[PDB]
Design a protein around this ligand. Structure first.
Ligand SMILES: CC(C)=CCC/C(C)=C/CC/C(C)=C/COC(CO)CO
Ligand code: DMA
Ligand code: DMA
Ligand SMILES: [Mg+2]
Ligand SMILES: [Mg+2]
Lengths: 222, 211
């Protein structure tokens, strides 16, 4: 991308989850229409990707859109779907192992992303980039209750089973909440909230989240 | 006044979750042994109860201890279990509808609390007080094998509106994965035994500021 001065970290998370929230508030604050913020969320994702590749983060999961989000106005649904498609396509121009997880048994799921619903190497690969597209926490848990008979097997067979435990979850837009992102993988996740809206992303947001992470005692109830 | 005037709130959560974390760090900071913090966590719980009753909170769920917590040394297990028993027994002397949710199929689950594993009205009731005792997220979700989502072990406990965690960590530690999917989370930096009413007031000011 371009040259940065990235701090040195004593400890790095294996898996970062990103909640790129605040697109509508960002747009309204700039006197744009609510749905116009999503198109300004793509370059921030690429800056996150570039930083994570440079420091050697193993896996990053981006919250794209939920089944609940598809209750919003058509004009917003078209805007955030278009922006999610573009984000996956942009990572597909770089070096990544791409996975899209979400309900593909829905008219809402974009045909453009079906090819990424199995993990796909692009360029030199290495870093795992996941996207949650038409994802729902209820759909994810209930996927298991149907397609797993046993109980101990249920957990291993949730819809998002390819996505491992989230070490660090970073949420833009100043809300401290999961919005149903990966309930199983996020039970022990250390959560960092950035007050600025996602389109106002700065590398310093990610650096401060990583400083937060390396400062945590990760005890897992022990 | 002696006790801070309880502020008047323009919005209130129906259901507050409490994670009373930091007992061991609190004890170690005082030069006590790791296990000596838990007994100093009981009165804070009663202060939360008193304030929630006064402002008219419908439901409060306390995180007591988890299956993961039973990995800890036996001296710590006995100390936190003893403190959880005493907490429920103290609420049992007041006005509450008490429910204990947790894995009762374990010699770790205290016999004293079996009677509260069905919702129990004490005094005038009018507030629902839940305790998670030998609770595990994994046990909760997998319990359904006993519609499946509506038959999780914690199914009686509704959506958490506001989650307040003491001890400075911003994490769920597996508290009620289903009910916490949209919960607004407020972290208090002070360890649970350093509870002050202003901790709770600031959490509720945070909640009424959320959209
Ligand atoms: C790696 C890259 C390139 C991009 C990652 C970011 C991304 C998915 C951008 C796409 C548009 C976007 C902001 C969607 C998020 O919207 C939801 C959250 O608030 C629902 O409204
Ligand atoms: C009372 C209670 C169950 C607290 C949760 O924190 P924890 O210390 O048990 O977990 P963690 O190690 O994830 O902070
Ligand atoms: C499991 C439980 C009863 C949590 C309360 O604090 P703690 O025992 O986790 O103490 P700390 O967070 O300081 O280790
Ligand atoms: Mg939002
Ligand atoms: Mg703790």
């Amino acid at each position: 991308g371009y040259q940065m001065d990235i701090p040195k970290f004593k400890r790095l998370p294996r898996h970062i989850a990103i909640i790129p929230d605040g697109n509508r508030r960002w747009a309204l604050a700039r006197g744009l229409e609510k749905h116009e913020g999503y198109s300004s969320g793509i370059i921030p994702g690429l800056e996150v990707y570039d930083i994570c590749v440079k420091i050697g983060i193993g896996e990053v999961t981006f919250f794209g859109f939920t089944q609940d989000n598809t209750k919003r106005p058509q004009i917003q649904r078209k805007a955030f779907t278009d922006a999610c498609i573009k984000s996956v396509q942009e990572i597909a121009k770089r070096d990544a192992e791409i996975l899209v997880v979400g309900n593909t048994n829905s008219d809402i799921f974009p045909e453009e992303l079906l090819e990424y619903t199995k993990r796909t190497k692009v360029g030199k690969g290495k870093i795992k980039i996941n996207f949650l597209i038409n994802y729902g926490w209820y759909w994810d848990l209930t996927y298991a209750y149907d397609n797993s008979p046993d109980g101990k097997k249920m957990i291993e067979n949730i819809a998002s089973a390819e996505i491992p435990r989230v070490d660090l979850l970073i949420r833009w837009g100043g809300r401290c909440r999961l919005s149903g992102m990966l309930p199983v993988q996020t039970v022990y996740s250390d959560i960092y909230v950035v007050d600025e809206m996602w389109p106002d992303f700065k590398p310093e947001h990610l650096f401060k989240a990583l400083e937060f992470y390396q400062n945590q005692d990760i005890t897992l109830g022990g």
